[PDB]
Amino acid sequence: GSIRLADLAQQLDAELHGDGDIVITGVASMQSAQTGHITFMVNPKYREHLGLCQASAVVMTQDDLPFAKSAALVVKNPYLTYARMAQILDTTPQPAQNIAPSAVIDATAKLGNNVSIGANAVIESGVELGDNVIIGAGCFVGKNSKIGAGSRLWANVTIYHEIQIGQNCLIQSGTVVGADGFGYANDRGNWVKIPQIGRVIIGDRVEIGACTTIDRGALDDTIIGNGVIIDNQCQIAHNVVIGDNTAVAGGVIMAGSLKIGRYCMIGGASVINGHMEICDKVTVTGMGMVMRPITEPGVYSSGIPLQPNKVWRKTAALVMNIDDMSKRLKSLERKVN
Amino acid sequence: SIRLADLAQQLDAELHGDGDIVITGVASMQSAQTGHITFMVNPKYREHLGLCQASAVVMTQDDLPFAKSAALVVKNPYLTYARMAQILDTTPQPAQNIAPSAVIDATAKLGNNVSIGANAVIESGVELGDNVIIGAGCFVGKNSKIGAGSRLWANVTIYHEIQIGQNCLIQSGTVVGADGFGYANDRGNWVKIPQIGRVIIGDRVEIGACTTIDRGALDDTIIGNGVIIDNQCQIAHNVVIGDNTAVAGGVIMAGSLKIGRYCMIGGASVINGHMEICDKVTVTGMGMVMRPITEPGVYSSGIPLQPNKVWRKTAALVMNIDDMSKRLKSLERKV
Amino acid sequence: GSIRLADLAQQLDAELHGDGDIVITGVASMQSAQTGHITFMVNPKYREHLGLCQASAVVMTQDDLPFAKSAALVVKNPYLTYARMAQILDTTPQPAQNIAPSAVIDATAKLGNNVSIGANAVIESGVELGDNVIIGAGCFVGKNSKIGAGSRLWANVTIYHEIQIGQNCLIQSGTVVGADGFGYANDRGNWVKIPQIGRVIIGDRVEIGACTTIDRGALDDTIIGNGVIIDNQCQIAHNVVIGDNTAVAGGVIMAGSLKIGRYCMIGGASVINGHMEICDKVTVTGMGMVMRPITEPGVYSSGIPLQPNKVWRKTAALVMNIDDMSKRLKSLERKVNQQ
Ligand SMILES: CC1(C)CC(=O)c2c(nc3nn(-c4ccccc4)c(O)c3c2-c2cccs2)C1
Ligand SMILES: CC1(C)CC(=O)c2c(nc3nn(-c4ccccc4)c(O)c3c2-c2cccs2)C1
Ligand SMILES: Cc1ccc2c(c1)-c1c(cnn1CC(=O)Nc1ccc3c(c1)OCCO3)CO2
Ligand SMILES: [Mg+2]
Ligand SMILES: [Mg+2]
């Protein structure tokens, strides 16, 4: 939806330098922007490049202003302003509008005001959908689950029974919330299923990527705190607890009964052992092999990275034989001493 | 609800306390309230059984002196817990009866008491055995066969010509029978090899959510009886998994791997193909399996986490370990 | 489906030795093949085994021919001929045929000729489906997305809005194309979503496995080149660009803004970090941990493989303490150097 530059500047708390009557139609990258677009500059190395940008307006700082070759919106934080203006001008559609005649909705489900449910979605008995909730096409929402006001599911999301989802969450397609945890007892080599009768509780303002799986708890619950952001294809096992505002990047695999504190950052493709705790304010870099508890805040890493194959063959063989190398070092130390 | 004495009989457990107590459900020790049965495995909880508010606790004989409530005495509290949770299970079924919005080919062959959820799609020639339950939004492709008692949660995809045994359970988002990753090369251009084998899943197999099991190229991908597979796993074409093996979350297996019986594959392991793992092998988490495993036991890989400042030095030195080796050999020659 | 052996041989450009009137019904492995089946031999150790194979015909080389115990098709490349004959005799069904009454299709969607849309599929406003496109049961195709002629989606594929897919592509079930990239700003310790208003552009002849995710770009686009093959459970982040003919095996994760060249081969379970480039003709072996750009073609690897647990415990402890081993070696060198 188009907006006058002066009105956009007011909504952004930006200082306008230039024509307030310019009409802005959307956001674009600096290299792709054309007339009607607003863009932003975060890297001052691009000052000398601004004459190449065809945007109608550029968000920048006060120090950048002398280098502008366009209307400019001056702010302290161009990146955050970009995020805000991209929300004002967002072109992303809603997953559904109104209630599709092909949706299958149990007579006992409770729908708030202004709820939309897409084609062929399936809502079980006892479900409660808060005001402004949007359920995409093809979703399934299981018995007695509750989805708080303003939350949105994209197409083909699966929510099992007895799940609680807070307000203003966003779940991408293919995600499964509330499948059975991996709970089995062993009887003489045969696995005996343990029914998983806990739940999943997801807080407010949680964003979950695509094809992520969050299993329900065995007895007590799997819990995702407020403001958590989880990328695609993560596995959050039964009885995991993830503290408020933690970020989990793509493809992280967590085992059961892991507790992660608040304010953590878990890098993509990490692997985290279960039945243990990671304290608040921990960053694990990508592909981290988290075998043991983390008890102090800070940054932690693992992994021996890529080498040319010919070199790697020697590295791996020598590491595998490092005990012999250690024994030889000690023997030579003794001989020299 | 069930009387404690009746529950104790079904569990073959020895009752110490009031058999007339009514048990309504299972709970953890910390959450248990009047009416709940709970269990303990670790002796550390003995000291505060007096804070547990369950109506009964499953425990061992050595635990009995510490009991502060009715107690069921058994040899294996964890297994008894599994059985009592089955007796008291509150989990609903994926569907009941056949939904009017399900789309079912007239040539599907349906047993007795089959339930099919809303908007599920059943192709021609599919056979569903007695008591099979197909969740909402599933797809079951042409000529696939699902044995008696098996159940699919919502939004499961089964391709064509797949065979699934009796009493299996498949969680949502899983895909069984997609094409294996098979391509010839005609001068830099990939040429698709149609994948015309199948997947054969035995009896009592449980598969997690968003797991993929690909069909074979000519012969079949095979999942043995009693296998349990967690979420986010990839089982490539022509993999064979032996009975009772367990595969934890996020494991990736390459084509034509054969895994034996009673194996335990830890989470996020990577198992290469065209090789065999014998029976009774455990691979720990993130294991990098490059070679056949011919003896039972526990196997591991990986250099675990360190503080970043320490890791930087560890990785740099490991990357230069050939130079360290050459320097050591030079020093030996000199000495 | 069935075809006379002489006709199959002509279509494969193979030399027939045997009865061209044999009727071939399908392809099978050597171990499983029965009357009516054609099979192939690539490994000459099986020459002595050919009398146990009950196929009606076997594809083989001229050097294998004296060992035959069946009608034979002689070719230079049995494996490639196998791929071609399996295509000729393919038993794989189509994801759908015709337009299902239970599909929900916006009035503004545009269909080419001979499109098939499966049961309970959902097609949004503005979608364009090319000639011969097949959309499987239960799929979702979001607003304004375009799928080129001959492309096929299996059941339960999700395509978001503003996605472009070329011709003759194949996408397996459970895959999600165009979900939001993992983009957030920081407002005084609160995450602020960055709308992901770029797209995904997929070229021609791309095959994508099952439960793979390919996120849309933040402003500009995620791009998959022509002829790319991507296995199951892969994660392609926002703004990744993959060059023509690259192959990505199962379970690979690629972080945002990675650029991969043409003719690359990325082994299963690799982890490729972002904001960097991999040049053409690079092979990364399985489980590779890619932290830096790759500027020269060739083969690259990482990872310390499995050992018995008791051995691994000692290996890991010694590696974690390798700085002390390095210091000890340096001290010993100074002593041997008389310093
Ligand atoms: C949340 C944010 C706005 C900032 C952030 O913290 C983050 C972001 N995207 C990431 N992608 N990958 C990734 C993905 C796949 C493979 C390898 C790496 C990370 O590790 C990512 C991280 C993190 C780095 C270290 C801890 S979390 C976006
Ligand atoms: C594309 C092709 C026809 C040939 C090919 O190169 C390839 C293929 N299938 C693979 N499966 N896995 C795999 C899968 C899961 C776990 C571990 C390994 C690889 O790594 C594979 C590779 C590659 C090897 C090195 C770089 S790509 C089939
Ligand atoms: C996730 C993680 C991360 C880092 C790790 C470990 C685990 C780990 C290491 C050594 N032991 N463990 C625990 C482990 O792998 N247990 C295990 C093994 C096989 C199984 C299983 C559990 O669940 C049932 C299926 O088979 C090395 O670092
Ligand atoms: Mg319908
Ligand atoms: Mg992985």
From TrEMBL, chain B:
Keywords: Acyltransferase, Lipid A biosynthesis, Lipid biosynthesis, Lipid metabolism, Repeat, Transferase
Pathway the protein contributes to: Glycolipid biosynthesis; lipid IV(A) biosynthesis; lipid IV(A) from (3R)-3-hydroxytetradecanoyl-[acyl-carrier-protein] and UDP-N-acetyl-alpha-D-glucosamine: step 3/6
UniProt-listed CDD domains: LbH_LpxD
A GO molecular-function descriptor: N-acyltransferase activity
Keyword Glycosyltransferase recorded: no
Residues annotated as the enzyme's active site: 237
Transmembrane domains' residue ranges: none
Subunit note: Homotrimer.
Similarity comment text for this entry: Belongs to the transferase hexapeptide repeat family. LpxD subfamily.
Name of this protein: UDP-3-O-(3-hydroxymyristoyl)glucosamine N-acyltransferase
Name of the gene encoding the protein in the UniProt record: lpxD
